[PDB]
From a paper:
The [name] transporter system is composed of a periplasmic binding protein, [name], and a type I ABC-type importer consisting of a heterodimer of its transmembrane domain components, EppB and EppC, and a dimer of its nucleotide binding domain component, EppD. [name] binds free [name], but not metal–[name] complexes, restricting the ability of [name] [name] to use only weak metal–[name] complexes that can dissociate to free [name], making it imperative to determine the biophysical mechanism of [name]’s binding specificity before any improvements to its binding capabilities can be engineered. Based on its three-domain, bilobate structure, the β2β1β3βnβ4 configuration of the core β-sheet of Domain III, and the two-β-strand hinge, [name] is a Class II Cluster C periplasmic binding protein. In summary, [name]’s affinity for [name], EDDA, and EGTA, and its putative affinity for other APC chelators via molecular docking, suggests that it is a general binding protein for aminopolycarboxylates.
[name] crystallized without its ligand [name] in the tetragonal space group P43212 with one molecule in the asymmetric unit. For both structures, all but the first four N-terminal residues (Gln27 through Leu30) of the mature protein (Gln27 through Glu563) were visible, and the C-terminal His-tag from pET30a(+) was visible through its first three His residues. Based on the relatively weak (e.g., no large, hydrophobic intermolecular interfaces) crystallographic and non-crystallographic protein–protein interactions in both the P43212 and P212121 crystal lattices, [name] is monomeric, which we confirmed by calculating a molecular mass of 63 kDa for the single chromatographic peak observed by analytical size-exclusion chromatography. The tertiary structure of [name] was bilobate and composed of three domains, denoted here by convention used for periplasmic binding proteins as Domains I, II, and III. Through the comparison to other Class II Cluster C PBPs and the support by molecular docking of [name] (Section 2.3), the interface of Domains I and III established the putative ligand-binding cleft, with one end of the cleft capped by Domain II. In its observed state, this binding cleft had a volume of 688 Å3 and was solvent accessible, as shown by the presence of 35 water molecules occupying the extended binding cleft. Highlighting the counterbalancing charges, electron densities for two sulfate ions were clearly observed to be bound electrostatically in the ligand-binding cleft by Arg56 (water-mediated), Arg74, Lys470, and Arg480. Of the four cationic residues identified by molecular docking, Arg480 was the only residue situated outside of binding cleft within a short loop (Arg477 through Gln481). The loop had two conformers: Conformer A had a refined occupancy of 60% and was held in place outside of the binding clef by Asp447, and Conformer B had a refined occupancy of 40% and was oriented toward the binding cleft.
Author numbering: 31 to 566
The structure:
């Protein structure tokens, strides 16, 4: 029985001074997390201490307005939708220049698809729904007017950049694509700022002397040490080379090892991630273009056994995920997978689905309706996730009674970015869920979107997602979006499995360090990090 909540784990009041080193798994070649090439958890973690945010995702998956930056943010009208931001007078960049509407306007122009068509952004995420963005004479009152309703407005302006510096480095595209992406940032609007960068080795941050927030910073230096081999991170922690690690794809052996290091002052936190494992099925081409084969495969997969073999031995009460649009804790969630018989391990039902579509078993091999053997299925998955490797082998075994064979494929060319209609049949990977399911869904399920790898092609799904993204609450959005989840599961091109576990493993002298099991991650509150005081 504990008094800590997910939002208050490891709380305390640290002393002043000292250093903390946090291991990260990628080198930094792009410093702009909002760009296409900078959008990953490492860049996000390393730049969260320097980039101010209007709202921040918290460990309970809520959005909290940043009261260091903002006095208020208010939806002041809905005819048309209007949001007013009042920036604190004392919010300033590290050179003393106030943070103002100039910074909101610059970011909006880079993200809105219109004013900077050459900006190489990750995604607009609704900034394009803002049609006018104006500021008062003081620069501290910013009014956004929308061309149509948009639920996810608190997700906007989550990363602000110094417009007065960008303007010294070319036009907007040049400054966004070059200055803000390629240069080590000399500026900050947060508690820390970069002192030095040793490529491939170490980012060193120091306090921003003009930090304007309520708390911190407490450390003399905050360092991010680059360790690309994530399996060497626990050794580095034990040796004192780093004080915090946050590896992806934690295993039972990793948990047991970390637990054995308690005598060295090491502790750990683990939670269900916003990242969720899935198996995608190639509905565009190859054997999986036949929905009957997709449904038969999904019905034969035994999801209980999959989780029993790969999660249950070291993770208690770990939830199945039976939706492709909602995590188990989000409004709208239901087991739409199991409602359709997917994941039930039901070989006889799967064989019936195949027989009713004209397939036949001959000599232990499945024949397509024309009479030709179904090809060996190409099941690919990216490296670095032992659970995915184990699940690929288990899935091979579940479908072998259907007369199907698999070829297991991996390596650096087996990433989602490199998928082609012609180079896979099944693919195991993960998606990262967002606070607004309808916003994430618009990136995955629409024709011609960046993450529609498995061939969803349904104007009704797209219409539903658009209505859900226009709703006035997350709850109403979920009620609307549930219909799209049903239709997406009917199509059987995406099979949800379960959430990845996070693993934050660290020296317990560090206070206010806690898991934030979402894309924003543990560096959401570095102003509060510090070392516990020893006794005088």
């Amino acid at each position: 029985v504990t008094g800590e909540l997910i939002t208050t784990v490891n709380s305390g009041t640290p002393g002043k001074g000292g250093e903390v080193t946090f291991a990260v798994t990628r080198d930094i070649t792009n410093w702009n997390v909002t760009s296409a090439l900078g959008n990953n958890a490492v860049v996000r973690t390393v730049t969260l201490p320097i980039v101010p945010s209007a709202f921040m995702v918290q460990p309970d998956f809520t959005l909290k307005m940043n009261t260091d930056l903002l006095e208020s943010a208010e939806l002041t009208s809905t005819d048309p939708q209007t949001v007013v931001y009042r920036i604190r007078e004392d919010a300033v960049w590290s050179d003393g220049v106030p943070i103002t509407g100039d910074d909101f306007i610059y970011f909006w122009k880079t993200q809105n698809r219109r004013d900077c068509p050459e900006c190489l952004i990750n995604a607009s995420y609704g900034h394009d729904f803002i049609e006018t963005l104006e500021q008062d004479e003081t620069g501290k009152v910013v009014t956004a007017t929308f061309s149509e309703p948009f639920l996810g407005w608190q997700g906007l302006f989550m990363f602000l950049y110094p417009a007065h510096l960008a303007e010294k480095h070319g036009d907007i595209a040049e400054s966004y694509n070059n200055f803000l992406s390629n240069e080590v940032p000399a500026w900050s609007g947060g508690p820390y700022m970069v002192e030095s960068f040793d490529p491939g080795q170490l980012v060193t941050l120091v306090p921003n002397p003009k930090w304007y927030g309520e708390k911190g910073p407490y450390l003399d230096k905050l360092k991010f040490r680059i360790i690309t081999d994530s399996t060497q991170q626990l050794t580095a922690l034990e040796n004192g080379e780093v004080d915090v690690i946050y590896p992806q794809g934690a295993t039972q052996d990793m948990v047991e090892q970390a637990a054995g290091l308690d005598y060295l002052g090491i502790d750990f936190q683990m939670n269900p991630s916003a990242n969720w494992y899935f198996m995608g099925l190639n509905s565009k081409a190859g054997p999986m273009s036949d929905i009957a084969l997709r449904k038969a495969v999904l019905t034969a997969i035994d999801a209980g056994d999959l989780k029993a073999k790969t999660a249950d031995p070291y993770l208690r009460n770990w939830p199945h995920m039976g939706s492709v649009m909602f995590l188990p804790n989000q409004a709208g969630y239901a087991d739409r997978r199991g409602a359709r018989g997917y994941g039930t391990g039901d070989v006889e039902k799967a064989k019936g689905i195949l027989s009713e579509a004209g397939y036949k078993l001959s000599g232990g091999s499945l024949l397509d309706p024309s009479g030709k053997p179904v090809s060996t299925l190409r099941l690919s998955f990216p490296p670095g996730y032992p659970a995915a490797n184990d699940m690929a082998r288990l899935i091979t075994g579940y479908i072998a009674p259907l007369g199907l064979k698999t070829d297991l494929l991996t390596g650096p060319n087996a990433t989602a970015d490199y998928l082609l209609s012609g180079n896979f049949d099944l693919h195991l990977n993960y998606f990262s869920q967002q606070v607004f399911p309808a916003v994430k869904a618009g990136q995955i399920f629409l024709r011609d979107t960046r993450q529609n790898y498995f061939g969803f092609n349904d104007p009704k799904i797209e219409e539903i997602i658009g209505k859900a993204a226009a709703a006035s609450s997350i709850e109403e959005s979920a009620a609307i979006l549930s219909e799209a989840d049903e239709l997406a599961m009917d199509y059987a091109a995406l099979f949800p499995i379960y959430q990845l576990p996070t693993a934050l493993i660290y020296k317990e002298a560090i206070l206010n360090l806690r898991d934030n099991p979402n894309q924003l991650g543990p560096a959401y509150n570095t102003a509060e990090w510090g070392l516990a005081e020893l006794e005088h």
